[PDB]
Amino acid sequence: CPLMVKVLDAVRGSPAINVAVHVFRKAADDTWEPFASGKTSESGELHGLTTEEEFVEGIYKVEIDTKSYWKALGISPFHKHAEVVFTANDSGPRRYTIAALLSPYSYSTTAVVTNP
Amino acid sequence: CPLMVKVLDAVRGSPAINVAVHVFRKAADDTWEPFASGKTSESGELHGLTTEEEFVEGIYKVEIDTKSYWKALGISPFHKHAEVVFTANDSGPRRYTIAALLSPYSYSTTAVVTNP
Amino acid sequence: CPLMVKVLDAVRGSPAINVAVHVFRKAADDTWEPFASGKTSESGELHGLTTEEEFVEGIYKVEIDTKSYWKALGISPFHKHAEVVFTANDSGPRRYTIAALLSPYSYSTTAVVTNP
Amino acid sequence: CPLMVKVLDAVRGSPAINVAVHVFRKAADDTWEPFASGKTSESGELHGLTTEEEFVEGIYKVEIDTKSYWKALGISPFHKHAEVVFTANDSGPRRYTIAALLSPYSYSTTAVVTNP
C-alpha cells in the first residue's frame, strides 16, 4: 500500500468517516488524469487506492471532499475541498501517508513518507 | 482590502517573505480565470490583491507557491504549492483573510472572515 | 509590544475574542511566577502584556484559556487550556508574537520572532 | 490501550522517533503526580502507557519533550515542550489518541477519542 490517506475531524475529535478522496496524476499533456478514488473508513483511513505497479513517478493531486463531509454534518464550511499536490517516487518507490485535519474554516495536511 | 493573505514559516518562526500568491475566480465553464497576484511583504502579508468592486460573490482559488519559497531557503519541500479554494459571500460586509502556516511536509490554512 | 498574542477560531473563521491569556516567568526555584495577563480584543489580539524593560531573557509560559472560550460558545472542548512554554532571547532586538489556532479537539501554536 | 500518543515531524515528513513523553494525573491536592512515561517507537507511536484499570477519571497532562527531539537533530527550537491537558473518562472509559505535529517554531496537537 504505497499511498494512504487519513482524515480527522478537529471539532468532534474523531476520525472523519465516509469522506470522498479523489487522486489524479498529471499526464503528458499537463492535464490531470483520474488515478484512483475511495472513501474513508470508520477509522478515517483510506487504504487500497493503488498498487506498487500502478503508482509510478509523477505529480499527483489528492483532493479531499471536505465540503460534502461538513454539509452532511449540517455545517456550511469555508473550503470547497482540501487539495494536496506533490511529486511522488522521484528517487524510487516510497510509502506516502497524506493526513488531513479538518475544521469548518481551517485544515491542515501533512505528508509522512517512509521506506518499506 | 476585501481579500488579504498572510503566510508564516513554522521552521524559522518568521513571516514567509517573497512568497508568490496567485488568485483565480471560477468561470461558468469551470475553468479557473486568473484574477490577482502578488508577493508577500516583509510582514508575510499581501494586501491590495483586489477591490470591493471587483471581489464579487463566486468561487475563488488562492495558490501559494510554497515549493519556490522552500527552495529559496535550501530546505527540501513536499508540496508543489498550497491551494485554498472557497466560496465568497453573502450577507453584510465581509473581509477575508487567508492565513497559511508552512512547514516543508505540512501546511495549514485558515480563513478569518470579519466585518468592519 | 515585545510580546503579543493572537488567537483565531478555526470553527467560526473569526478572531477568538475575549480569550483570557496569562503569562508566567520561571523562577530559579522552577516555580511559575505570574507576570502578565489580559483578554484578547475584537481582533483576537492581546497587546500591552509587558514592556521591553520587563521582558528579560528567561523561560516563559503563556496559558490560553481555551476551555472557557469554547464553553461561552456552547461547543464541547477537549483541552483544559493551551499552554505555550519557550525561552526568550538573545542576539539583537526581537519581538515575539505567539499565534494560536483553536478547534475544540485540536490547537496549533506558532511563534513569529521578528525585529524592528 | 486507552491512551496512545503519536508524534510526527513536519520538517522531515517522518514519524518523530524516540521522543520522550511524560504523563501526569492531577492529585487530590491539585498537584501533578507522575502517571506514566515512554518514548515513541520507529513509527512515532507510544503504546502501552497505561491500562484500563489504571486510567481512571481525572485531569491528565501529557508532556512531549519536543526540545530534546529537535536538539538531537541539531536545531534549537522555540518551545521547551508541548503539553496537552484534558479531563479523561468523565462519561465512562474512552480510548484517547493524542497526536502531535512538530516543527521547530510551531506545533499542533489533536485528540481523537473513540469507543472501543
Short mmCIF file of C-alpha atoms in Angstrom, two decimals:
data_model
loop_
_atom_site.label_atom_id
_atom_site.label_comp_id
_atom_site.label_asym_id
_atom_site.label_seq_id
_atom_site.Cartn_x
_atom_site.Cartn_y
_atom_site.Cartn_z
CA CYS A 1 0.00 0.00 0.00
CA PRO A 2 2.05 2.93 -1.29
CA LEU A 3 -0.50 5.68 -0.83
CA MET A 4 -2.75 6.02 2.22
CA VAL A 5 -4.97 8.96 3.31
CA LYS A 6 -6.07 9.59 6.87
CA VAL A 7 -8.65 12.29 7.83
CA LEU A 8 -9.52 13.59 11.27
CA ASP A 9 -12.29 15.94 12.44
CA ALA A 10 -10.95 18.57 14.84
CA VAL A 11 -14.43 19.64 16.01
CA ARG A 12 -15.68 16.24 17.11
CA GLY A 13 -12.24 14.71 17.96
CA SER A 14 -13.00 11.71 15.76
CA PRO A 15 -11.88 10.08 12.50
CA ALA A 16 -13.65 11.76 9.57
CA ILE A 17 -15.71 8.84 8.22
CA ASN A 18 -17.03 8.39 4.63
CA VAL A 19 -15.04 11.30 3.27
CA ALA A 20 -14.58 11.09 -0.53
CA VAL A 21 -11.00 11.28 -1.79
CA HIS A 22 -10.04 11.60 -5.47
CA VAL A 23 -6.46 11.08 -6.77
CA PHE A 24 -5.27 12.41 -10.09
CA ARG A 25 -1.90 12.10 -11.88
CA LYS A 26 -0.53 14.76 -14.23
CA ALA A 27 -0.43 13.45 -17.81
CA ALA A 28 1.99 14.02 -20.58
CA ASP A 29 -0.08 16.97 -21.85
CA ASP A 30 -0.09 18.64 -18.38
CA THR A 31 -3.79 17.81 -17.79
CA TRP A 32 -4.98 15.86 -14.71
CA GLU A 33 -5.98 12.30 -15.26
CA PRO A 34 -8.12 10.40 -12.77
CA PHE A 35 -5.84 7.90 -10.97
CA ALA A 36 -7.90 6.49 -8.14
CA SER A 37 -10.64 7.31 -5.54
CA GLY A 38 -12.31 5.95 -2.43
CA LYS A 39 -13.97 6.88 0.84
CA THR A 40 -12.50 6.92 4.31
CA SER A 41 -13.46 4.04 6.62
CA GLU A 42 -14.80 4.10 10.18
CA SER A 43 -11.25 4.78 11.30
CA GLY A 44 -10.81 7.84 8.98
CA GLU A 45 -8.40 5.84 6.75
CA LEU A 46 -8.41 5.06 3.08
CA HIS A 47 -6.24 2.16 2.06
CA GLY A 48 -6.09 0.26 -1.17
CA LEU A 49 -6.14 3.29 -3.53
CA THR A 50 -3.34 1.90 -5.68
CA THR A 51 -0.54 -0.65 -6.05
CA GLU A 52 3.22 -0.50 -6.29
CA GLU A 53 2.91 -1.23 -10.05
CA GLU A 54 0.43 1.43 -10.79
CA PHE A 55 1.91 4.17 -8.58
CA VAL A 56 4.74 5.30 -10.83
CA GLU A 57 6.81 8.55 -10.65
CA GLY A 58 4.73 11.56 -11.38
CA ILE A 59 2.96 14.60 -9.97
CA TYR A 60 -0.16 13.63 -8.04
CA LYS A 61 -3.12 15.54 -6.70
CA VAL A 62 -5.14 14.20 -3.77
CA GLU A 63 -8.48 16.04 -3.48
CA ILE A 64 -10.37 15.52 -0.26
CA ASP A 65 -14.03 16.43 -0.43
CA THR A 66 -14.25 18.33 2.81
CA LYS A 67 -17.32 20.40 1.79
CA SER A 68 -19.54 17.29 1.43
CA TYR A 69 -18.28 15.99 4.77
CA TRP A 70 -19.25 19.19 6.68
CA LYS A 71 -22.51 19.62 4.81
CA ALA A 72 -23.57 16.04 5.75
CA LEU A 73 -23.00 17.15 9.36
CA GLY A 74 -25.13 20.36 8.81
CA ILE A 75 -22.20 22.89 8.72
CA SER A 76 -21.55 25.24 5.81
CA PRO A 77 -17.77 25.17 5.69
CA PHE A 78 -15.48 27.69 4.08
CA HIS A 79 -13.37 25.49 1.79
CA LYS A 80 -14.68 23.60 -1.26
CA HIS A 81 -12.03 20.89 -0.73
CA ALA A 82 -8.56 20.27 0.52
CA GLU A 83 -6.15 19.55 -2.31
CA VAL A 84 -2.69 18.17 -1.75
CA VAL A 85 -0.25 18.22 -4.80
CA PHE A 86 3.20 16.60 -4.78
CA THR A 87 5.81 14.72 -6.78
CA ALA A 88 5.99 11.02 -5.89
CA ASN A 89 8.61 8.32 -6.27
CA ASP A 90 11.19 10.65 -7.77
CA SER A 91 14.09 8.81 -6.03
CA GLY A 92 12.49 5.38 -6.07
CA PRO A 93 9.29 3.91 -4.52
CA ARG A 94 8.24 5.28 -1.18
CA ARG A 95 5.16 4.81 1.05
CA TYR A 96 3.12 8.05 1.38
CA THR A 97 0.50 8.82 4.04
CA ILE A 98 -1.40 12.03 3.46
CA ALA A 99 -3.04 13.12 6.69
CA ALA A 100 -5.56 15.86 6.94
CA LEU A 101 -7.12 17.58 9.94
CA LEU A 102 -10.48 19.28 9.29
CA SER A 103 -12.35 22.18 10.85
CA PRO A 104 -15.15 24.20 9.18
CA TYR A 105 -12.86 27.23 8.49
CA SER A 106 -9.43 25.60 8.50
CA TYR A 107 -7.50 22.49 7.56
CA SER A 108 -4.03 21.19 7.79
CA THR A 109 -2.35 18.48 5.82
CA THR A 110 0.87 16.59 6.46
CA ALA A 111 2.74 14.03 4.44
CA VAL A 112 4.55 11.13 6.13
CA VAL A 113 6.97 9.43 3.76
CA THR A 114 8.64 6.22 4.68
CA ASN A 115 10.70 3.35 3.17
CA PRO A 116 9.12 -0.05 3.49
CA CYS B 1 -8.55 45.14 1.44
CA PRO B 2 -11.57 42.70 0.93
CA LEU B 3 -9.09 39.88 0.46
CA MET B 4 -5.75 39.56 2.24
CA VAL B 5 -3.26 36.74 2.51
CA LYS B 6 -0.82 36.15 5.36
CA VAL B 7 1.88 33.44 5.28
CA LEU B 8 4.05 32.26 8.21
CA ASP B 9 7.12 29.96 8.24
CA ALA B 10 6.90 27.34 11.02
CA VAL B 11 10.60 26.27 10.60
CA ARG B 12 12.18 29.67 11.05
CA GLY B 13 9.39 31.27 13.18
CA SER B 14 9.11 34.23 10.79
CA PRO B 15 6.76 35.72 8.28
CA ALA B 16 7.18 33.96 4.94
CA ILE B 17 8.59 36.77 2.79
CA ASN B 18 8.64 36.93 -1.01
CA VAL B 19 6.09 34.16 -1.43
CA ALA B 20 4.25 34.31 -4.79
CA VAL B 21 0.46 34.11 -4.45
CA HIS B 22 -1.99 33.83 -7.35
CA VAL B 23 -5.78 34.18 -7.15
CA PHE B 24 -8.26 32.75 -9.64
CA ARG B 25 -12.01 33.01 -9.97
CA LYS B 26 -14.08 30.16 -11.33
CA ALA B 27 -15.79 30.87 -14.64
CA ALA B 28 -19.27 29.41 -15.61
CA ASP B 29 -17.30 26.87 -17.76
CA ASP B 30 -15.46 25.69 -14.55
CA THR B 31 -12.10 26.90 -15.87
CA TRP B 32 -10.00 28.93 -13.45
CA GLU B 33 -9.64 32.60 -14.57
CA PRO B 34 -6.51 34.39 -13.15
CA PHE B 35 -7.72 37.33 -11.22
CA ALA B 36 -4.93 38.74 -8.90
CA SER B 37 -1.46 38.04 -7.73
CA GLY B 38 1.47 39.37 -5.78
CA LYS B 39 4.30 38.55 -3.43
CA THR B 40 4.14 38.63 0.34
CA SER B 41 5.82 41.57 2.08
CA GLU B 42 8.35 41.58 4.91
CA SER B 43 5.50 41.05 7.29
CA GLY B 44 4.35 37.95 5.27
CA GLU B 45 1.26 39.85 4.13
CA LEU B 46 -0.16 40.51 0.77
CA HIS B 47 -2.65 43.40 0.59
CA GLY B 48 -4.14 45.15 -2.44
CA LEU B 49 -4.96 41.97 -4.45
CA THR B 50 -8.39 43.28 -5.34
CA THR B 51 -11.10 45.86 -4.62
CA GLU B 52 -14.63 45.75 -3.20
CA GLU B 53 -15.95 46.46 -6.74
CA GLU B 54 -14.10 43.50 -8.27
CA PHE B 55 -14.39 40.99 -5.49
CA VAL B 56 -17.95 39.72 -6.22
CA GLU B 57 -19.55 36.51 -4.87
CA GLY B 58 -18.15 33.42 -6.51
CA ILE B 59 -15.72 30.59 -6.07
CA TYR B 60 -12.08 31.56 -5.68
CA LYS B 61 -8.72 29.73 -5.60
CA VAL B 62 -5.71 31.13 -3.84
CA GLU B 63 -2.47 29.35 -4.91
CA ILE B 64 0.54 29.86 -2.68
CA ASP B 65 3.86 28.91 -4.26
CA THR B 66 5.34 27.12 -1.27
CA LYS B 67 7.76 24.99 -3.30
CA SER B 68 9.69 28.04 -4.55
CA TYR B 69 9.79 29.56 -1.06
CA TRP B 70 11.39 26.40 0.46
CA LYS B 71 13.76 26.10 -2.48
CA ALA B 72 15.00 29.71 -1.85
CA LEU B 73 15.82 28.56 1.72
CA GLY B 74 17.65 25.29 0.80
CA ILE B 75 15.06 23.22 2.52
CA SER B 76 13.53 20.18 0.73
CA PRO B 77 9.65 20.52 0.36
CA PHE B 78 6.90 18.02 -0.27
CA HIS B 79 4.07 20.02 -1.73
CA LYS B 80 4.09 21.64 -5.21
CA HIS B 81 2.01 24.57 -3.83
CA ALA B 82 -0.67 25.14 -1.27
CA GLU B 83 -4.06 25.84 -2.89
CA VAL B 84 -7.05 27.21 -0.97
CA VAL B 85 -10.47 27.03 -2.71
CA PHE B 86 -13.60 28.68 -1.24
CA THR B 87 -16.89 30.40 -1.85
CA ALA B 88 -17.21 34.15 -1.18
CA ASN B 89 -20.35 35.74 0.48
CA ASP B 90 -23.28 36.83 1.23
CA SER B 91 -24.92 38.68 3.97
CA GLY B 92 -23.46 42.02 5.16
CA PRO B 93 -19.96 43.46 4.62
CA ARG B 94 -17.12 40.95 4.86
CA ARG B 95 -13.31 40.96 4.70
CA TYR B 96 -11.50 37.68 4.12
CA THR B 97 -8.00 36.92 5.35
CA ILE B 98 -6.49 33.63 4.19
CA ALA B 99 -3.77 32.66 6.64
CA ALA B 100 -1.27 29.88 5.88
CA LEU B 101 1.35 28.27 8.16
CA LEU B 102 4.08 26.47 6.26
CA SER B 103 6.41 23.55 7.03
CA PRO B 104 8.25 21.56 4.46
CA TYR B 105 5.97 18.46 4.75
CA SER B 106 2.85 20.15 6.18
CA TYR B 107 0.75 23.25 5.92
CA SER B 108 -2.37 24.60 7.45
CA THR B 109 -4.68 27.29 6.20
CA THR B 110 -7.44 29.12 7.92
CA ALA B 111 -9.93 31.69 6.79
CA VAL B 112 -10.63 34.66 9.11
CA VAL B 113 -13.87 36.33 7.91
CA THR B 114 -14.74 39.60 9.63
CA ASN B 115 -16.53 42.77 9.13
CA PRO B 116 -15.64 46.40 9.54
CA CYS C 1 4.90 45.34 22.23
CA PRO C 2 7.86 42.85 22.83
CA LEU C 3 5.31 40.11 23.39
CA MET C 4 1.97 39.81 21.63
CA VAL C 5 -0.59 37.05 21.45
CA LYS C 6 -3.05 36.41 18.63
CA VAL C 7 -5.81 33.78 18.80
CA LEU C 8 -8.00 32.54 15.92
CA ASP C 9 -11.13 30.32 15.97
CA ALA C 10 -10.97 27.59 13.28
CA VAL C 11 -14.70 26.63 13.74
CA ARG C 12 -16.20 30.05 13.16
CA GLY C 13 -13.37 31.50 10.98
CA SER C 14 -13.01 34.53 13.26
CA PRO C 15 -10.63 36.06 15.72
CA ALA C 16 -11.09 34.43 19.13
CA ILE C 17 -12.44 37.34 21.17
CA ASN C 18 -12.48 37.64 24.96
CA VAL C 19 -10.00 34.83 25.48
CA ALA C 20 -8.15 35.06 28.83
CA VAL C 21 -4.37 34.75 28.50
CA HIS C 22 -1.93 34.52 31.42
CA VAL C 23 1.87 34.77 31.20
CA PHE C 24 4.32 33.37 33.74
CA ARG C 25 8.08 33.56 34.06
CA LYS C 26 10.08 30.70 35.53
CA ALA C 27 11.80 31.49 38.80
CA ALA C 28 15.25 29.98 39.84
CA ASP C 29 13.22 27.57 42.06
CA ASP C 30 11.35 26.32 38.91
CA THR C 31 8.02 27.65 40.18
CA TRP C 32 5.97 29.65 37.69
CA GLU C 33 5.70 33.36 38.68
CA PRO C 34 2.61 35.18 37.20
CA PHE C 35 3.89 38.02 35.16
CA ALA C 36 1.13 39.41 32.79
CA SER C 37 -2.35 38.75 31.64
CA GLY C 38 -5.25 40.08 29.65
CA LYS C 39 -8.10 39.24 27.32
CA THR C 40 -7.94 39.19 23.55
CA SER C 41 -9.55 42.11 21.71
CA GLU C 42 -12.08 42.08 18.88
CA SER C 43 -9.24 41.39 16.52
CA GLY C 44 -8.17 38.33 18.65
CA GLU C 45 -5.03 40.21 19.73
CA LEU C 46 -3.59 40.94 23.06
CA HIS C 47 -1.03 43.78 23.14
CA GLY C 48 0.49 45.60 26.11
CA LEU C 49 1.24 42.48 28.23
CA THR C 50 4.70 43.74 29.07
CA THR C 51 7.47 46.22 28.26
CA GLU C 52 10.99 45.98 26.85
CA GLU C 53 12.34 46.77 30.36
CA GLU C 54 10.42 43.92 31.99
CA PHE C 55 10.65 41.31 29.31
CA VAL C 56 14.17 39.98 30.09
CA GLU C 57 15.70 36.68 28.85
CA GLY C 58 14.22 33.69 30.59
CA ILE C 59 11.72 30.90 30.25
CA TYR C 60 8.11 31.94 29.82
CA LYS C 61 4.70 30.20 29.81
CA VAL C 62 1.73 31.61 28.00
CA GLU C 63 -1.55 29.95 29.13
CA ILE C 64 -4.55 30.44 26.88
CA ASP C 65 -7.89 29.63 28.50
CA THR C 66 -9.41 27.78 25.58
CA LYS C 67 -11.88 25.77 27.67
CA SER C 68 -13.74 28.91 28.81
CA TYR C 69 -13.80 30.31 25.28
CA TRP C 70 -15.48 27.14 23.87
CA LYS C 71 -17.85 27.00 26.81
CA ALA C 72 -19.01 30.62 26.06
CA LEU C 73 -19.85 29.35 22.53
CA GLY C 74 -21.77 26.17 23.56
CA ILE C 75 -19.23 23.97 21.92
CA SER C 76 -17.77 20.97 23.82
CA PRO C 77 -13.88 21.22 24.17
CA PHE C 78 -11.20 18.69 24.89
CA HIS C 79 -8.32 20.66 26.29
CA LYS C 80 -8.30 22.40 29.70
CA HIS C 81 -6.15 25.23 28.22
CA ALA C 82 -3.45 25.65 25.64
CA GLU C 83 -0.05 26.33 27.23
CA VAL C 84 2.97 27.55 25.27
CA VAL C 85 6.39 27.36 27.02
CA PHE C 86 9.55 28.87 25.50
CA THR C 87 12.89 30.54 26.04
CA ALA C 88 13.29 34.25 25.24
CA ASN C 89 16.47 35.71 23.53
CA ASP C 90 19.43 36.70 22.74
CA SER C 91 21.11 38.41 19.93
CA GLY C 92 19.73 41.74 18.63
CA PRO C 93 16.27 43.29 19.12
CA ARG C 94 13.37 40.84 18.96
CA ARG C 95 9.56 40.95 19.12
CA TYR C 96 7.67 37.73 19.82
CA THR C 97 4.15 37.01 18.62
CA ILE C 98 2.56 33.80 19.89
CA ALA C 99 -0.18 32.81 17.47
CA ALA C 100 -2.74 30.12 18.33
CA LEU C 101 -5.41 28.50 16.11
CA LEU C 102 -8.17 26.83 18.07
CA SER C 103 -10.58 23.94 17.40
CA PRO C 104 -12.46 22.08 20.04
CA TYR C 105 -10.26 18.92 19.86
CA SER C 106 -7.10 20.48 18.37
CA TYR C 107 -4.92 23.54 18.53
CA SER C 108 -1.77 24.76 16.95
CA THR C 109 0.60 27.43 18.11
CA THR C 110 3.40 29.14 16.32
CA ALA C 111 5.95 31.69 17.36
CA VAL C 112 6.72 34.56 14.94
CA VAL C 113 10.01 36.18 16.08
CA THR C 114 10.95 39.38 14.25
CA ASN C 115 12.82 42.51 14.64
CA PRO C 116 12.01 46.15 14.09
CA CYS D 1 -4.73 0.51 25.27
CA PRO D 2 -6.71 3.52 26.45
CA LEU D 3 -4.09 6.20 25.90
CA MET D 4 -1.83 6.37 22.83
CA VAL D 5 0.46 9.22 21.64
CA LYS D 6 1.56 9.70 18.06
CA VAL D 7 4.21 12.30 17.01
CA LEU D 8 5.11 13.46 13.53
CA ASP D 9 7.94 15.69 12.28
CA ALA D 10 6.66 18.27 9.78
CA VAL D 11 10.16 19.21 8.58
CA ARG D 12 11.33 15.74 7.60
CA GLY D 13 7.86 14.27 6.81
CA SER D 14 8.54 11.33 9.11
CA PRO D 15 7.39 9.85 12.42
CA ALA D 16 9.19 11.59 15.29
CA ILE D 17 11.19 8.66 16.74
CA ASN D 18 12.50 8.32 20.35
CA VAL D 19 10.58 11.32 21.60
CA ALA D 20 10.11 11.25 25.41
CA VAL D 21 6.54 11.57 26.66
CA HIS D 22 5.59 12.05 30.33
CA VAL D 23 2.00 11.66 31.64
CA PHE D 24 0.84 13.14 34.91
CA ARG D 25 -2.53 12.97 36.71
CA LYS D 26 -3.84 15.75 38.96
CA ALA D 27 -3.97 14.56 42.59
CA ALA D 28 -6.37 15.29 45.34
CA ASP D 29 -4.23 18.23 46.50
CA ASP D 30 -4.18 19.78 42.97
CA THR D 31 -0.50 18.84 42.41
CA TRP D 32 0.64 16.75 39.40
CA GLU D 33 1.55 13.20 40.08
CA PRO D 34 3.65 11.16 37.67
CA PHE D 35 1.30 8.65 35.95
CA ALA D 36 3.33 7.09 33.17
CA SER D 37 6.08 7.75 30.55
CA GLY D 38 7.72 6.24 27.49
CA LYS D 39 9.40 7.02 24.19
CA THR D 40 7.93 6.97 20.72
CA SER D 41 8.83 3.99 18.52
CA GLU D 42 10.16 3.89 14.95
CA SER D 43 6.63 4.61 13.81
CA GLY D 44 6.27 7.76 16.02
CA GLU D 45 3.81 5.90 18.31
CA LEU D 46 3.80 5.25 22.02
CA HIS D 47 1.56 2.44 23.13
CA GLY D 48 1.36 0.66 26.43
CA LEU D 49 1.49 3.77 28.68
CA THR D 50 -1.34 2.52 30.88
CA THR D 51 -4.20 0.06 31.34
CA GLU D 52 -7.96 0.30 31.57
CA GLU D 53 -7.67 -0.29 35.35
CA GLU D 54 -5.12 2.32 36.00
CA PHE D 55 -6.54 5.02 33.69
CA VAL D 56 -9.34 6.30 35.90
CA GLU D 57 -11.32 9.58 35.60
CA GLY D 58 -9.17 12.57 36.23
CA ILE D 59 -7.33 15.51 34.71
CA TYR D 60 -4.24 14.40 32.82
CA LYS D 61 -1.23 16.20 31.41
CA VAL D 62 0.76 14.70 28.53
CA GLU D 63 4.14 16.45 28.18
CA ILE D 64 6.01 15.77 24.98
CA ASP D 65 9.69 16.60 25.12
CA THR D 66 9.95 18.38 21.81
CA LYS D 67 13.07 20.40 22.76
CA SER D 68 15.22 17.26 23.24
CA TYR D 69 13.93 15.88 19.94
CA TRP D 70 14.98 18.98 17.92
CA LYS D 71 18.25 19.40 19.77
CA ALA D 72 19.21 15.76 18.97
CA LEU D 73 18.67 16.76 15.31
CA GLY D 74 20.88 19.93 15.75
CA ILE D 75 18.01 22.53 15.75
CA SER D 76 17.42 25.00 18.58
CA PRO D 77 13.63 25.02 18.70
CA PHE D 78 11.41 27.66 20.22
CA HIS D 79 9.25 25.58 22.58
CA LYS D 80 10.52 23.78 25.70
CA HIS D 81 7.80 21.12 25.26
CA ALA D 82 4.31 20.54 24.03
CA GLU D 83 1.89 19.97 26.88
CA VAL D 84 -1.61 18.65 26.37
CA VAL D 85 -4.04 18.87 29.42
CA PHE D 86 -7.52 17.34 29.45
CA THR D 87 -10.18 15.59 31.52
CA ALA D 88 -10.45 11.87 30.76
CA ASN D 89 -13.14 9.25 31.23
CA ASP D 90 -15.66 11.69 32.65
CA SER D 91 -18.60 9.86 30.98
CA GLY D 92 -17.08 6.39 31.13
CA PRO D 93 -13.92 4.80 29.64
CA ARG D 94 -12.84 6.02 26.26
CA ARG D 95 -9.78 5.40 24.05
CA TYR D 96 -7.66 8.58 23.60
CA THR D 97 -5.02 9.18 20.91
CA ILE D 98 -3.04 12.37 21.38
CA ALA D 99 -1.38 13.30 18.12
CA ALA D 100 1.21 15.97 17.78
CA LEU D 101 2.80 17.55 14.71
CA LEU D 102 6.21 19.18 15.30
CA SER D 103 8.14 21.99 13.65
CA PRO D 104 10.99 23.99 15.24
CA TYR D 105 8.78 27.10 15.82
CA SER D 106 5.31 25.55 15.87
CA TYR D 107 3.31 22.53 16.92
CA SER D 108 -0.19 21.31 16.73
CA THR D 109 -1.94 18.71 18.79
CA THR D 110 -5.20 16.87 18.22
CA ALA D 111 -7.14 14.43 20.33
CA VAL D 112 -9.01 11.52 18.75
CA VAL D 113 -11.47 9.96 21.17
CA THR D 114 -13.22 6.76 20.36
CA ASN D 115 -15.34 3.99 21.98
CA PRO D 116 -13.85 0.55 21.77
#
